[PDB]
């Protein structure tokens, strides 16, 4: 052998990960913990809690204007949200991809409003991609109606494609899968897996929380002269300042 998983937790659901580049573990995060994430998000939403280095996207406004939160990133200095990263149920599985030295590298809570494909790695200037994993958990029932994740199975085996931005303007040849998930369900997936969110044709805001983890043994690459040049918009340091040791030891990242 396997390239995308290590030994052990897991069966020929390794064989699945290896052919597909994603794996869904049912009812992984307790209802209790999901509600705690919900609660903290809404406090942020009421400007009652103001975490330290947190980024807020308000990409939608509403009138009867006033802007609504649609994503928060870099919540590593917020305690209830950061428990997601430290949660032993999440880590018993993360280790299968990263190994025993684990860094929580990118944190998001996504609040998709009522209504494009990409590779998360476009944004990550660190390697090997095989020792990096996104852990993405449904904070409510997510189906095709409210914009669940779409994935192109097996594209984790292919190259890093160029992006404009949320970006790939092409390379398919395996039928898409819509990841309908229940509350607490978690999907694990590779940074080169081509994916996107479908339309949210409901009137509700659709919540998921997620983290990309990477082996501490990984390293930082220079993106000048590559497809990734654009992300710079030094970079090693912003990602170093953001990275948090979540298990084992901080070796190299
Ligand atoms: O809409 C989502 O839940 C995930 C968004 C996404 O794919 C990303 O930020 O990379
Ligand atoms: Fe993504």
From Swiss-Prot:
Keywords: Cataract, Deafness, Dioxygenase, Disease variant, Ichthyosis, Iron, Metal-binding, Oxidoreductase, Peroxisome, Peroxisome biogenesis disorder, Phosphoprotein, Retinitis pigmentosa, Transit peptide, Vitamin C. Its cofactor is Fe cation; L-ascorbate; ATP; Mg(2+). It is an enzyme of class 1 (oxidoreductase). Pathway: Lipid metabolism; fatty acid metabolism. 2-oxoglutarate binds at residues 71, 108, 118-120, 136, 197, 206. GO terms for molecular function: carboxylic acid binding; ferrous iron binding; L-ascorbic acid binding; phytanoyl-CoA dioxygenase activity. InterPro entries: PhyH, Phytyl_CoA_dOase-like. One of its GO terms (cellular component) is cytosol. Its EC number is 1.14.11.18. Expressed in liver, kidney, and T-cells, but not in spleen, brain, heart, lung and skeletal muscle. It is found in: Peroxisome. Catalyzes the 2-hydroxylation of not only racemic phytanoyl-CoA and the isomers of 3-methylhexadecanoyl-CoA, but also a variety of other mono-branched 3-methylacyl-CoA esters (with a chain length of at least seven carbon atoms) and straight-chain acyl-CoA esters (with a chain length longer than four carbon atoms). Does not hydroxylate long and very long straight chain acyl-CoAs or 2-methyl- and 4-methyl-branched acyl-CoAs. Belongs to the PhyH family. Interacts with FKBP52. Interacts with PHYHIP. This is Phytanoyl-CoA dioxygenase, peroxisomal. It comes from Homo sapiens (Human).
